[PDB]
Amino acid sequence: YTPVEEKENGRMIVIVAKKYEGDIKDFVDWKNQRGLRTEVKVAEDIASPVTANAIQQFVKQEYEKEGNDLTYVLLVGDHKDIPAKITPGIKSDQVYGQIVGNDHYNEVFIGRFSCESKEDLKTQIDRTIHYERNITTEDKWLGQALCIASAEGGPSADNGESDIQHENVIANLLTQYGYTKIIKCYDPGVTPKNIIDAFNGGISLVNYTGHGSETAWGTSHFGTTHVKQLTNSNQLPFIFDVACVNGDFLFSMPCFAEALMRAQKDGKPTGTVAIIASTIDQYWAPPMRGQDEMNEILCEKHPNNIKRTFGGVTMNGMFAMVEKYKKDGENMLDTWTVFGDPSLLVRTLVPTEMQVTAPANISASAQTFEVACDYNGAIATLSDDGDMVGTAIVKDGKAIIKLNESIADETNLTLTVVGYNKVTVIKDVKVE
Ligand SMILES: *CC(=O)[C@H](CCCNC(=N)N)NC(=O)[C@H](Cc1ccccc1)NC(=O)[C@H](N)Cc1ccccc1
Ligand SMILES: [Ca+2]
Ligand SMILES: [Ca+2]
Ligand SMILES: [Ca+2]
Ligand SMILES: [Ca+2]
Numbered sequence: 001y002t003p004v005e006e007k008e009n010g011r012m013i014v015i016v017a018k019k020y021e022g023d024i025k026d027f028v029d030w031k032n033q034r035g036l037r038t039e040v041k042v043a044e045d046i047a048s049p050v051t052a053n054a055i056q057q058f059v060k061q062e063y064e065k066e067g068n069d070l071t072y073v074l075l076v077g078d079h080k081d082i083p084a085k086i087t088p089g090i091k092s093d094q095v096y097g098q099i100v101g102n103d104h105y106n107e108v109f110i111g112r113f114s115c116e117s118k119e120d121l122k123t124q125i126d127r128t129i130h131y132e133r134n135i136t137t138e139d140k141w142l143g144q145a146l147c148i149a150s151a152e153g154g155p156s157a158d159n160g161e162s163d164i165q166h167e168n169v170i171a172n173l174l175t176q177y178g179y180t181k182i183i184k185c186y187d188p189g190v191t192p193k194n195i196i197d198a199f200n201g202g203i204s205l206v207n208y209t210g211h212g213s214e215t216a217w218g219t220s221h222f223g224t225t226h227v228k229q230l231t232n233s234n235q236l237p238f239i240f241d242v243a244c245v246n247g248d249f250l251f252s253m254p255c256f257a258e259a260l261m262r263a264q265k266d267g268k269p270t271g272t273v274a275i276i277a278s279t280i281d282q283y284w285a286p287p288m289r290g291q292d293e294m295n296e297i298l299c300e301k302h303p304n305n306i307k308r309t310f311g312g313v314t315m316n317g318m319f320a321m322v323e324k325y326k327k328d329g330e331n332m333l334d335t336w337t338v339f340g341d342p343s344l345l346v347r348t349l350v351p352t353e354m355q356v357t358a359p360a361n362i363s364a365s366a367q368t369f370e371v372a373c374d375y376n377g378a379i380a381t382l383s384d385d386g387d388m389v390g391t392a393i394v395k396d397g398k399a400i401i402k403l404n405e406s407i408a409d410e411t412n413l414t415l416t417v418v419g420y421n422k423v424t425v426i427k428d429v430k431v432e
């Protein structure tokens with residue numbers, strides 16, 4: 001299949017319901033600070049009442065603009081705030097990113113921060129910023145994974161694997177890549193305690209393959225009522241969830257996925273940093289292929305298809321499903337919904353540090369700024385209070401940042417450098 005790229009110069013639009021307009025600033029500032037051009041659009045400004053047709057039209061319109069650099073779209077609100085596209089048998093956010101080619105292969109990654117209160121939003125913003133900005137060499141819970149499998153399935157499943165055999169292949173792939181601990185919770189016998197203990201012990205990735213209801217997992221019986229028992233404060237995994245309706249966010253109560261994204265303990269984020277879960281019932285075999293490819297891409301098994309964002313990893317993993325299962329695969333892709341930031345830079349192992357050498361000062365008339373970094377591929381960005389002044393990728397040991405405006409009016413600039421499985425570096429640059 002042809003992958004959908006995380007365009008180096010891509011941008012993001014956060015479509016936020018009016019009642020949350022004044023609460024998203026810190027998120028928008030951080031994204032611009034690390035080099036992802038991000039703009040905000042108030043949903044009611046697109047149309048009031050807000051409808052699925054208007055959102056769809058707005059995204060298409062923005063995508064068509066000269067360059068087609070639109071790459072991510074984050075929806076901020078629950079279904080009542082920003083609706084999902086609803087057609088017979090389909091509830092979907094993913095469809096908003098299907099713009100070209102009369103097909104179901106997205107052009108744009110879509111994600112959602114489902115919130116019904118200000119704190120639901122604040123906790124999703126904070127956990128995301130902490131994950132990309134504040135993870136250090138001491139966050140030892142990274143590189144540890146949890147595989148969960150029902151005792152069902154067989155020869156007629158994807159690649160003829162029962163859910164257990166399917167998860168074992170995934171566990172081997174993760175181990176080969178470098179994960180240091182794989183926890184296996186396979187039926188029969190899994191209880192809520194087993195899941196609660198795993199999360200509380202520290203894990204950065206969860207793969208689930210089995211049955212599910214709107215509010216719980218069939219294997220373990222762990223559900224929304226058990227979320228309050230989690231104490232994995234800012235030690236959050238992301239999840240590839242194969243199950244029926246765990247992601248039905250139009251349910252009368254918070255669904256499984258929403259509960260995990262909104263969980264908090266004494267003001268700190270618990271639960272998950274991101275999860276992809278279905279709004280409808282899932283077929284047995286198709287999602288298995290998608291889940292496998294997501295893990296293959298995460299473990300960099302395809303050198304010319306590297307994806308660093310949660311949206312990029314999951315969407316490209318689903319392309320393989322569509323390719324092999326066709327129509328059935330397309331229905332699964334449309335409804336397998338991303339909860340969390342689609343631009344999220346995933347972490348797989350305990351990070352290492354980067355050696356960054358940059359001038360302590362910059363001329364008020366400078367057009368460029370050179371930074372030395374011992375990690376090629378890092379993204380170096382200069383910003384001013386959430387305003388991105390220039391960004392560049394490290395190549396051959398250095399990044400040559402071209403300023404997009406005059407800094408003659410500034411006294412200080414913030415240099416931010418991020419890198420895959422690296423500790424984020426933030427330095428000040430005095431303007432002389
Ligand atoms: C509801 C679930 O949680 C279950 C999730 C399966 C995930 N894949 C793996 N664990 N490997 N889904 C089902 O059990 C599925 C639900 C469904 C019902 C009606 C239409 C479409 C999906 N049911 C089945 O797979 C059964 N084999 C019945 C069936 C449905 C569709 C075609 C053929 C058989
Ligand atoms: Ca397309
Ligand atoms: Ca509260
Ligand atoms: Ca498999
Ligand atoms: Ca049960």
Ligand SMILES: [Ca+2]
Binds near residue numbers: 251
């Ligand atoms: Ca909801």
Ligand SMILES: [Ca+2]
Binds near residue numbers: 296297
């Ligand atoms: Ca593959």
Ligand SMILES: [Zn+2]
Binds near residue numbers: 130134
């Ligand atoms: Zn923090």
Ligand SMILES: [Zn+2]
Binds near residue numbers: 152211
């Ligand atoms: Zn079954």
